[PDB]
Design an enzyme around this catalytic site. Structure first.
Site, mmCIF file in Angstrom:
data_model
loop_
_atom_site.group_PDB
_atom_site.id
_atom_site.type_symbol
_atom_site.label_atom_id
_atom_site.label_comp_id
_atom_site.label_asym_id
_atom_site.label_seq_id
_atom_site.Cartn_x
_atom_site.Cartn_y
_atom_site.Cartn_z
ATOM 1 C CG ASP A 90 -3.418 6.936 -7.871
ATOM 2 O OD1 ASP A 90 -3.136 5.853 -8.419
ATOM 3 O OD2 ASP A 90 -3.372 8.024 -8.475
ATOM 4 C CB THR A 99 1.823 8.633 -10.177
ATOM 5 O OG1 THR A 99 1.227 8.205 -8.950
ATOM 6 C CG2 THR A 99 0.938 8.214 -11.332
ATOM 7 C CB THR A 100 3.701 6.261 -5.770
ATOM 8 O OG1 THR A 100 2.333 6.601 -5.544
ATOM 9 C CG2 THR A 100 4.433 6.291 -4.455
ATOM 10 C CG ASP A 140 -4.320 3.023 -10.705
ATOM 11 O OD1 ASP A 140 -5.114 3.944 -10.981
ATOM 12 O OD2 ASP A 140 -3.288 3.208 -10.029
HETATM 13 N N1 LIG Z 1 2.771 -8.393 -3.718
HETATM 14 C C1 LIG Z 1 3.837 -7.579 -3.888
HETATM 15 N N2 LIG Z 1 5.019 -7.842 -3.299
HETATM 16 C C2 LIG Z 1 6.081 -7.037 -3.464
HETATM 17 N N3 LIG Z 1 6.070 -5.923 -4.209
HETATM 18 C C3 LIG Z 1 4.949 -5.541 -4.854
HETATM 19 C C4 LIG Z 1 3.746 -6.366 -4.727
HETATM 20 N N4 LIG Z 1 2.792 -5.768 -5.456
HETATM 21 C C5 LIG Z 1 3.341 -4.657 -6.006
HETATM 22 N N5 LIG Z 1 4.626 -4.529 -5.650
HETATM 23 C C6 LIG Z 1 5.522 -3.428 -6.054
HETATM 24 O O1 LIG Z 1 5.158 -2.242 -5.360
HETATM 25 C C7 LIG Z 1 5.497 -1.121 -6.174
HETATM 26 C C8 LIG Z 1 4.513 0.032 -6.025
HETATM 27 O O2 LIG Z 1 3.202 -0.394 -6.373
HETATM 28 P P1 LIG Z 1 2.134 0.732 -6.772
HETATM 29 O O3 LIG Z 1 1.974 1.638 -5.581
HETATM 30 O O4 LIG Z 1 0.954 0.099 -7.466
HETATM 31 O O5 LIG Z 1 2.980 1.517 -7.871
HETATM 32 P P2 LIG Z 1 2.928 3.107 -7.859
HETATM 33 O O6 LIG Z 1 3.915 3.386 -6.770
HETATM 34 O O7 LIG Z 1 3.421 3.501 -9.219
HETATM 35 O O8 LIG Z 1 1.489 3.455 -7.574
HETATM 36 C C9 LIG Z 1 5.607 -1.607 -7.608
HETATM 37 O O9 LIG Z 1 6.924 -1.364 -8.100
HETATM 38 C C10 LIG Z 1 5.343 -3.094 -7.521
HETATM 39 O O10 LIG Z 1 6.298 -3.797 -8.314
HETATM 40 MG MG LIG Z 2 0.112 0.883 -9.386
#
Ligand SMILES: Nc1ncnc2c1ncn2[C@@H]1O[C@H](COP(=O)(O)OP(=O)(O)O)[C@@H](O)[C@H]1O
Ligand SMILES: [Mg+2]
Ligand SMILES: Nc1ncnc2c1ncn2[C@@H]1O[C@H](COP(=O)(O)OP(=O)(O)O)[C@@H](O)[C@H]1O
Ligand SMILES: Nc1ncnc2c1ncn2[C@@H]1O[C@H](COP(=O)(O)OP(=O)(O)O)[C@@H](O)[C@H]1O
Ligand SMILES: [Mg+2]
Ligand SMILES: [Mg+2]
Lengths: 525, 536, 317, 526
Positions: free
Chosen positions: A58, A91-92, A392
């Site tokens: 996270d 956030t990331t 989340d």
């Molecule tokens: N199965 C998947 N295939 C491709 N991209 C994905 C998949 N699941 C999530 N993503 C993309 O990965 C990105 C980062 O996910 P996540 O780490 O949950 O967001 P954050 O970076 O805000 O924590 C998001 O923009 C999401 O659209």
């Molecule tokens: Mg997320």
């Protein structure tokens, strides 16, 4: 310099040096957080100064746990903390887009361009990107399948795939239960209890409540089948007088009478409870459970056990509302005029001992508007990780319900918004077009890093994806298993419109404010 | 050391006299640069960053950290001049130091210190007599502009100098406001009853003279009004709070049914007192004590303005000015508790006024007496403090001018005339006392010398011209009008200071001379010093 | 930063973490300017100090004090800084719930923690384990501490403080003259290894005063003996004394001797009681608030909202 | 041995003369140079690091100078005058510093040339008086009923700040807030935007959704979850008293010998709470708001009446709720009257923002208090937005009090400097030189504007000084965004006459203060 002539122990970074400081720190954060993005990202281990272990993917947790002392990093950490407080996710990606905006702005500022013009281009690109976002957003009736896909897109990034497939059903069912037609979802009505005994895939949704304590009288039952729940906030232990009364007696008999009398006040409330119990269940068929936000002394515990009542004491101030919404009674601060209508019903109540602690399950309620997620796992860090993941996921489903729109994922909206910004650039007057280009190349960091994390070439994948989106127009993103373009809406990769909007707004704002910084100064001594 | 075996150091003879003179000279050189319209201010930093800007010699010598006793004496001298007169605190220090210098020069020549002291005493007596007989002007002959000119002279050398043209009016008005007559029908001008508040913000020209009183207080509750017109004022010296039984009184319940009533009185008692006050018509209630929220609510509901923790001196002044009676208790000579409307005071308005993000109370147009407040307005707290000190000097000067109706000219006129007269008068008194009196005379010249030096002008030429004028005045009976000549430091030229308006209260110069002479005599008697090591 | 308010049954002694001295000693700590910068303080100046004998009597008073030790003598806002308050050992749960309701509800503090005054005293001396003998004006306390926490089960409480000490000296009545006896108590009152050889040239024993419970050395010994036999070495060898009461006679060696007598002939007992920084509890609180384990121990505002008096009581009933 | 026989304490250092003068002037002009680049619309932010690990990203002269620390007493005085300007008018806090620095800088010249500081000071005072005359001469009035004119006045004040991007939005907020805070009672007009206009910053969301509420907002939830969280016509009661049973102020010690007395006493406590709650219910409110606690038994009794309570509110929030809903705080429910009940609130809501519960008393009619709900990316961004909004609201207040306007873009500085130069030709003494130097010292404001715009100071200042020699050109100034001379009637940058008057006065008086200063002393203890 100016400040160092007045405060000699002053630290100062001026104009270009100040920019150099800020952008460098941003890029440092990006280098740490680049690996967090996506389901193919890597989990980092974080060890406190005490030795406690955190396994996390996270962005917000990672920031607050990294060991950093930089002012720009503080600014960006606070922006991410706000992102997390309001949306729960993003956030990331927030940090990545901030870092990439700063980098793409350095690309043009190193060429002698003034940061003001880049920030003007940032503002224009923000406007056009928000417009394109509202246009491409998918307004969808939030069905269990849609919400399941959303929660999958979040939990698969935060935890392992099988555990994500479990937490998906858990979270979606949890929200779809505490949800009232056209009435904002109060996530407080989802208690989150963690148990540390079984496997992590045993994490479940109890359609009821789980209190982290049980009865303290041994003769009290450990299982109750058809239970009347009395949710009260009334002290059933000895309360001394406010006015320092003090007892005065002349004989051991009088001392005995005063000892018997000093408890009459609480004996009366216990008697009220016992009379309600007898009047509502004249036999031993049903059960009666008192759950008090306040204390219960051993004498009251004995008096209630003798009549067959299960009394738990010093529950949580939120469990009052959770029990009145799950069971269906009325929470009381006094037993002045209590009636059977003040009681709730639970089709089962029992106790579970785990090492040295006790838990109390209240299940088989009729239609509980409050439920609990029982986070089971073998390790404290597994429990913490699953808690973060379910936070989340709950925020994701809540946001998809509140904002009935939903945005395609896998960087698809970012790719399309980059193309739209590049087609919009000529309509911008002056050299702020370059800032627009930077905005586009900043938006493009989401698919790039996804490719970077799936083990693919950023440049090749991104050209493939942009080509596919220009030839078809289909909102396409990264397939993390083939590196090819894929239609995110067709494969069930969904993101939150609120999250993307918050990203655009907050990232643009903080990046603008950083780019316009021309002097960092510590002169407070 | 040696034969004595005292556990300390011992200075003896010319050594300790030289040390004493060095110490006094040091103190005088600290303040010499702050004398006259061309004097400049001083910063003082208190080892912590606390800054103080000032031209007041008494203030400067108070803030300093002095160890030598002959310098502590001059600091105490400046303090005494500030207590008894209010102006002259720098001139007195300079004059004492110069008397010490010349007297030590005489003692080096082996004139006995007793003879120097006799000569100094004689010269002081005769200088006082000569001033009182030849150098005084009656303010009656001049009217009200004499007060304005004395105020402007006192304010010259301060941060309200050029604006004196206007500040003097305020100062004069303020003293005239606080005028009160006592038994024997003698008019008394009790300054320190003029209130002076400071508030950075608007320029000096926006400083305010309030005919009435200004309180560094505010209303107790935001629900109370903040302006009242026909103000009936109740000044109370007791607190309006929930009643607490005193030390020798205990509540002991043996029938719970009484407890409630007892608790109720703890508040109802105070309520009754307030009702009595409000029954008379009092719209404004100032108290030196506190006011509980329970009571503030009664004032709110009545439409009154209550103020708590007022200062006793502010309360005394508001009472004297409005016609009110400070009550320490609601208790009469009939063994009951009441509040009469005769104990109230009156005022044509009471307001809560905003002043640069800070509110105060203004009581305007009080009857039974006129009072005065002054709100000084500058650029920051340092300037405002310097303005307060300057204004205190000006007020004290105007008070002295009004008590004794005699003034003397400024610009070194008095010192030049005394130098002439005493250098001529020494010829009659002994042979060594003659030298002492001549040196007293010459010492007096340190004032015009310093004024000219500070103006960055030829001190020698200017003071020589002064002495020439004054000698012409004292040897030619047709030219006594030259007595009024002193320095013009904006042009470096003598000038008729009685016509220019450079006036100083006679008491200023007289007390300066008397105190400087005694200080010099005190220090000039020391011929030994035993400095013991500390007991520890 | 973290505000460290050290009530310590003294004054407020409030400030910030990292400061080696408090910045807000309110009880017994400008004019002619414009505004309410003296009147508002003039009100508090004559307000009775709530804590008596190490226990809060009037809570409204204490709350008004804290509020005036935040907005006036610190000119800060509690809505963004965590607070470390201090409580006397064996302080009733109700007082804890009251102060936690005040901080979280009134002052809206993001997080706070309540520490025992003896534990912070031990912290200021640099150690984390040992038995602290705190004897002030109204109470005497022995607090065994292991791993930095006051073992809540071996806290023996006897009552022989400044008052009880000066009592017999008075015996050897009027406020001023019993305060002459107390002035002698404040001044040198050297502890006697043996009263025999100390009276020859002219608390430890209840009979002396007139009590019938236990000496302070017996109290320490039994508080050490109600702990782990392995940590017994550390308790015996890290006895730290605090309190102006115990300082005035400067009692170190009489205690040491009779505690050695009581203890087995194994553990070597060393008592460190020379500091007298006159802010020990404050510095201990500052050390704690500076650490990151303080962030660990934070009772957060969200935690408070979710649990109430239960979060203040840390569950485990 | 023979311990030092000094006259002054060791560590007492005394400087004197032209070194002290030059040192003070250099310290002042250094304080000026610190914030010289923070003036105008094209300014850049500065990120200051507090001693408490905080961060302050700002353009505000007073914020910057307040966050830095100095030891030179002249720099102390300059920081103090910046504070003075901020407290008095709430804008111009860096224009004042620059003007004071330039005045001291030009006085250094005359001081090196054997002129006496008092001569320079008299000239400065003449020049200040004539500045006042010229400003009051060239000013124009404003119809404060013209909301658009007021929005332009406020824009001319926030254009130089970060919120300029949402300038129109912020303008409306400030105007709305001030128009609600205007209050009159007993013939005393009061715009108290410090006690009754509150800024609440909730990180997250977007700044474009920030708003000024027709009411107030606090961070609170119902005391008991059975209480309503949404009420559409709330009758509101405010209390300073605890709805608990507290002790008496005297030694109320009790003595029990009978059996029933303990129980009777505890029931007496319950009856006291009942009687308080009945004294409250008799007014039939919907919401009850206390500054002190509310016992759980009192919560029961109020809920029985279907009343929603909020337990521990601040006295300031209680005063704002009073002004907003039209209530009167009481401290004894026995003394409660219908006039003390709060009618005027149109809706009480308690909603979840993030993970917190916020109480809104909004939809009020004629609320004499308000809450500006700021939303944005972070606490730092929102702190800066709050300071900018403080500038805007303080400007609106200064306008509503003194509706006179003067031209911006440095137009006013050049017009007044020209008037002073023209008046100097009648001066025949020696003060004409410092007087004309102060006239040339006012020119620094447009100079700084041009420098921060990135243009040619010489050329533009020459054309502008020439333009201001014509007849009807006292409104001509410069753009801080392009570097060209314009008519302010055509650009729209108009400041409040009060602001610029206070600016000039503070600058000139600070110069006078530092010029009179000589002979620094140090060391002596407090
Ligand atoms: N199965 C998947 N295939 C491709 N991209 C994905 C998949 N699941 C999530 N993503 C993309 O990965 C990105 C980062 O996910 P996540 O780490 O949950 O967001 P954050 O970076 O805000 O924590 C998001 O923009 C999401 O659209
Ligand atoms: Mg997320
Ligand atoms: N306008 C003036 N012209 C000539 N001499 C003056 C003027 N004002 C004051 N003086 C002289 O300067 C001396 C000291 O004045 P000042 O320094 O202001 O008071 P103090 O000596 O109490 O500090 C006085 O003796 C007076 O004679
Ligand atoms: N668009 C503009 N073009 C030129 N000058 C401007 C513009 N906007 C504001 N100004 C001028 O900038 C000055 C305000 O500077 P600012 O950065 O707000 O600092 P301050 O705190 O001194 O007001 C005023 O002189 C105003 O006239
Ligand atoms: Mg004088
Ligand atoms: Mg401005």
């Amino acid at each position: 310099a100016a400040v160092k002539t007045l405060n000699p122990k002053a630290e100062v970074a001026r104009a270009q040096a100040a920019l150099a400081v800020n952008i460098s720190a941003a890029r440092g954060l990006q280098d740490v957080l680049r690996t967090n993005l996506g389901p193919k990202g890597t989990m980092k281990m974080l060890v406190s100064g005490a030795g406690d272990i955190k396994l996390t993917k996270d962005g917000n947790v990672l920031l607050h746990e990294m060991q950093i002392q930089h002012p720009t990093a503080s600014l960006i950490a606070k922006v991410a903390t706000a992102q997390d407080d309001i949306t729960g996710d993003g956030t990331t990606s927030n940090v990545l887009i901030i870092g990439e905006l700063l980098k793409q702005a350095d690309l043009y500022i190193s060429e002698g361009l003034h940061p003001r013009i880049i920030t003007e281009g940032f503002e224009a690109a923000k406007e056009k990107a928000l417009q394109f976002l509202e246009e491409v957003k998918v307004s969808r009736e939030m069905d269990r399948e849609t919400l399941i896909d959303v929660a999958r897109t979040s939990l698969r990034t935060k935890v392992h795939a099988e555990l994500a497939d479990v937490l998906t059903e858990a979270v979606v069912d949890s929200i779809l239960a505490i949800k009232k037609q056209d009435e904002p979802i109060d996530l407080f009505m989802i208690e989150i209890m963690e148990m540390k005994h079984k496997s992590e895939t045993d994490t479940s949704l109890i359609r009821g409540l789980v209190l982290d304590h049980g009865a303290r009288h041994p003769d009290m039952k450990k299982r109750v089948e058809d239970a009347y729940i009395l949710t009260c906030n009334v002290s059933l232990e000895y309360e001394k007088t406010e006015v320092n009364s003090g007892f005065f007696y002349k004989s051991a008999e009088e001392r005995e009478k005063l000892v018997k009398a000093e408890r009459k006040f609480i004996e009366d409330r216990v008697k009220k409870i016992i009379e309600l119990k007898r009047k509502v269940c004249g036999d031993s068929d049903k059960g009666f459970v008192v759950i008090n936000q306040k204390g219960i002394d051993p004498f009251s515990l004995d008096a209630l056990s003798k009549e067959g009542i299960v009394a738990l004491r010093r529950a949580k101030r939120r469990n009052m509302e959770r029990l009145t919404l799950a069971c269906g009674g009325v929470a009381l601060n006094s037993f002045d005029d209590l009636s059977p209508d003040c009681l709730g019903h639970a089709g089962l109540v029992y106790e579970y001992t785990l090492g040295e602690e006790k838990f109390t399950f209240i299940e088989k309620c009729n239609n509980p508007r409050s439920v609990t997620l029982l986070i089971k796992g073998p390790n404290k860090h597994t429990l913490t990780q699953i808690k973060d993941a379910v936070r989340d996921g709950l925020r994701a489903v809540k946001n998809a319900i509140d904002d009935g729109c939903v945005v395609p994922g896998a960087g698809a909206v970012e790719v399309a918004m980059a193309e739209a910004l590049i087609k919009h650039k000529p309509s911008v007057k002056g050299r702020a077009q370059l800032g627009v280009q930077a905005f586009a190349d900043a938006l493009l960091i989401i698919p790039k890093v996804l490719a970077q994390n799936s083990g693919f070439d950023l440049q090749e994948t991104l050209v493939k994806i942009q080509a596919e989106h220009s030839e078809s127009g289909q909102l396409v993103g990264v397939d993390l298993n083939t590196g090819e373009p894929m239609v995110a809406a067709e494969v069930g990769v969904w993101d939150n419109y609120c999250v993307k909007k918050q990203l655009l707004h907050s990232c643009t704002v903080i990046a603008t404010n950083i780019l316009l910084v021309d002097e960092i100064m510590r002169a407070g001594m | 050391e040696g034969p004595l075996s005292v556990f300390g150091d011992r200075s003896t003879g010319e050594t300790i006299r030289s040390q004493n003179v060095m110490a006094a000279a040091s103190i005088a050189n600290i303040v010499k640069s702050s004398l006259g319209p061309v004097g400049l201010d001083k910063m003082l930093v208190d080892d912590i960053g606390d800054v103080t800007i000032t031209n007041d010699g008494a203030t400067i010598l108070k803030l300093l950290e002095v160890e030598h006793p002959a310098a502590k004496v001059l600091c105490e001298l400046a303090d005494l001049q500030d207590k008894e007169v209010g102006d002259g605190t720098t001139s007195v220090v300079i004059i004492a130091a110069e008397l010490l210098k010349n007297a030590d020069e005489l003692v080096k020549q082996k004139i006995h210190p007793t003879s120097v002291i006799s000569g100094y005493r004689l010269a002081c007596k005769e200088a006082v007599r000569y001033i009182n007989e030849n150098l005084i002007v009656n303010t009656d002959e001049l009217g009200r502009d004499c007060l304005i000119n004395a105020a402007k002279t006192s304010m010259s050398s301060k941060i309200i100098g050029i604006n004196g043209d206007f500040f003097a009016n305020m100062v004069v008005d303020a003293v005239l406001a606080i005028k009160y007559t006592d038994i024997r029908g003698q008019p008394r001008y009790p300054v320190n009853s003029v209130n002076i508040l400071k508030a950075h913000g608007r320029s000096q020209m926006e400083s305010m003279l309030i005919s009435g009183y200004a309180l560094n207080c505010v209303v107790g509750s935001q629900g109370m009004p903040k302006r009242i017109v026909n103000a009936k004022i109740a000044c109370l010296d007791f607190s309006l709070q929930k009643t607490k039984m005193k030390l020798g009184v205990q509540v002991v319940i043996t029938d719970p049914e009484k407890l409630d009533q007892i608790r109720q009185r703890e508040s109802d008692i105070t309520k009754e007192r307030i009702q009595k006050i409000l029954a008379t018509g009092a719209n404004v209630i100032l108290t030196t004590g506190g006011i509980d929220d329970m009571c503030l609510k009664y004032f709110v509901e009545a439409g009154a303005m209550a103020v708590r923790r007022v200062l006793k001196r502010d309360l005394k002044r508001i009472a004297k000015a409005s016609g009110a009676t400070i009550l320490s208790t609601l208790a009469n000579l009939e063994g009951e508790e009441t509040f009469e409307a005769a104990m109230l005071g009156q005022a044509e308005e009471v307001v809560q006024e905003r002043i640069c993000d800070d509110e105060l109370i203004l009581i305007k147009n009080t009857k039974a007496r006129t009072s005065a407040s002054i709100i000084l307005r500058g650029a920051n707290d340092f300037m405002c403090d310097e303005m307060e000190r300057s204004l205190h000097d000006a007020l004290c000067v105007v008070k002295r001018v009004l008590e004794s109706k005699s003034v003397v000219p400024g610009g070194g006129a008095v010192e030049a005339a005394l130098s002439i007269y005493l250098e001529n008068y020494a010829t009659s008194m002994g042979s060594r006392e003659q030298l002492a009196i001549a040196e007293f005379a010459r010492s007096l010249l340190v004032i015009p010398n310093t004024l000219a030096v500070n103006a960055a002008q030829d001190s020698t030429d200017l003071v020589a011209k002064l002495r020439a004028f004054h000698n012409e005045a004292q040897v030619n009976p047709e030219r006594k009008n030259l007595k009024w000549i002193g320095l013009d430091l904006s042009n470096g030229k003598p000038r008729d200071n009685k016509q220019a308006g450079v006036f100083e209260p006679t008491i200023v110069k007289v007390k300066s001379l008397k105190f400087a002479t005694e200080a010099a005599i005190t220090i000039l008697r020391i011929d030994d010093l035993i400095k013991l090591h500390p007991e520890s | 930063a973290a505000l460290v308010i050290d009530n310590g049954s003294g004054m407020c002694k409030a400030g910030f973490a990292g400061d080696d001295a408090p910045r807000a000693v309110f009880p017994s700590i400008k004019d002619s300017y414009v505004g309410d910068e003296a009147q508002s303080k003039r009100g508090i100046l004559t307000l009775k100090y709530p804590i008596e004998h190490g226990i809060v009597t009037n809570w409204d008073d204490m709350e008004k004090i804290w509020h005036h030790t935040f907005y006036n003598e610190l000119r800060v806002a509690p809505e963004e800084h965590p607070v470390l308050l201090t409580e006397a050992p064996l302080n009733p749960k109700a007082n804890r719930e009251k102060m936690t309701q005040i901080m979280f509800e009134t002052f809206n503090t993001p997080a706070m923690y309540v520490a025992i005054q003896a534990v912070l005293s031990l912290y200021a001396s640099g150690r984390t384990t040992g038995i602290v003998m705190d004897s002030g004006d109204g109470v005497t306390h022995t607090v065994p501490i292991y791993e930095g926490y006051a073992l809540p089960h071996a806290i023996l409480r006897l009552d022989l403080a400044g008052r009880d000490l000066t009592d017999y000296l008075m015996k050897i009545t009027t406020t001023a003259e019993r305060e002459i006896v107390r002035d002698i108590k404040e001044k040198l009152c050297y502890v006697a290894l043996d009263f025999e050889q100390e009276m020859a040239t002219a608390l430890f024993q209840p009979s002396f005063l007139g009590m019938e419970s236990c000496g302070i050395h017996e109290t320490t010994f039994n508080s050490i003996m109600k702990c782990d036999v392995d940590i017994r070495k550390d308790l015996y060898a890290n006895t730290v004394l605090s309190g102006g009461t115990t300082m005035y006679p400067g009692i170190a060696d009489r205690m040491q001797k009779e505690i050695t007598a009581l203890a087995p002939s194994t553990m070597k007992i060393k008592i460190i009681a020379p500091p007298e920084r006159k802010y020990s509890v404050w510095i201990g609180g500052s050390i704690l608030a500076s650490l990151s384990t303080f962030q660990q121990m934070w009772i957060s505002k969200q935690e408070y909202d979710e649990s109430g008096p239960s979060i203040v009581h840390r569950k485990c009933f | 041995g023979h311990r030092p026989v000094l006259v002054l304490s060791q560590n007492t250092k005394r400087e004197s003369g032209r070194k002290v003068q030059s040192g003070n002037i250099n310290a002042a002009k250094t304080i000026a140079d610190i914030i010289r680049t923070c003036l105008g619309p094209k300014s850049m932010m500065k990120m200051l690091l507090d001693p408490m690990g905080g961060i302050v990203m700002t353009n505000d002269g007073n914020a910057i100078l307040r966050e830095i620390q100095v030891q030179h007493p002249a720099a102390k005085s300059m920081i103090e005058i910046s504070r003075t300007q901020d407290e008095e008018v709430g804008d111009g806090t860096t224009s004042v510093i620059i003007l004071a620095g330039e005045m001291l800088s030009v006085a250094e010249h005359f001081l090196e040339q054997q002129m006496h500081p008092t001569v320079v000071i008299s000239a400065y005072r003449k020049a200040l008086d004539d500045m006042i005359s010229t400003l009051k001469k060239i000013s124009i009035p404003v119809d404060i009923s013209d909301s658009d004119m007021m929005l332009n006045i406020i824009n001319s004040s926030i254009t130089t700040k970060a919120i300029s991007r949402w300038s129109s939005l912020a303008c409306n907020i400030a105007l709305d807030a001030v128009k609600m805070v205007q209050f009159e009672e007993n013939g005393r007009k009061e715009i108290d935007i410090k006690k009754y206009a509150r800024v609440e910053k909730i990180p997250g969301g977007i700044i474009e959704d920030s708003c000024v509420l027709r009411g107030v907002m606090i961070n609170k939830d119902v005391t008991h979850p059975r209480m309503r969280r949404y009420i559409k016509n709330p009758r509101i009661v405010l209390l300073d008293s605890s709805l608990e049973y507290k002790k008496g102020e005297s030694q109320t010690d009790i003595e029990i010998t009978r059996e029933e007395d303990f129980t009777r006493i505890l029931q007496m406590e319950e009856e006291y709470i009942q009687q308080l709650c009945e004294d409250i219910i008799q007014l039939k409110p919907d919401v009850v708001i206390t500054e002190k606690g509310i016992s759980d038994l009192a919560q029961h009794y109020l809920m029985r009446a279907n009343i929603t309570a909020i337990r521990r509110v601040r006295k300031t929030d209680n005063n704002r709720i009073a002004r907003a809903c039209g209530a009167r705080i009481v401290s004894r429910p026995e003394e409660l009257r219908e006039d003390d009940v709060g009618t005027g609130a149109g809706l009480l809501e308690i909603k979840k923002i993030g993970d917190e519960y916020f109480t809104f008393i909004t939809d009020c009619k004629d609320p004499k208090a308000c809450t500006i709900l700021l939303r944005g990316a972070s606490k730092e961004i929102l702190s800066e937005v709050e300071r900018n909004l403080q500038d805007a609201m303080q400007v609106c207040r200064n306008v509503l009090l003194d509706p006179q306007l003067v031209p911006g873009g440095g137009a006013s500085e050049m017009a007044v400097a020209h008037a002073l130069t023209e008046k100097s030709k009648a001066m025949t003494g020696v003060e004409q030189w410092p007087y004309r130097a102060v006239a040339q010292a006012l020119e620094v404001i447009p100079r700084t504007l041009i420098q921060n715009c990135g243009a040619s100071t010489i050329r533009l200042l020459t054309s502008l000084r020439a333009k201001h020699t014509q007849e009807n050109c006292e409104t001509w100034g410069v753009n801080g965004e392009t570097g060209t001379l314009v008519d302010m009637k055509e650009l729209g940058i108009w400041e409040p006459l009060a602001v610029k008057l206070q600016t000039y006065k503070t600058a000139v008086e600070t110069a006078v203060l530092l010029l009179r200063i000589d002979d620094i002393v140090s060391g002596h203890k407090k």
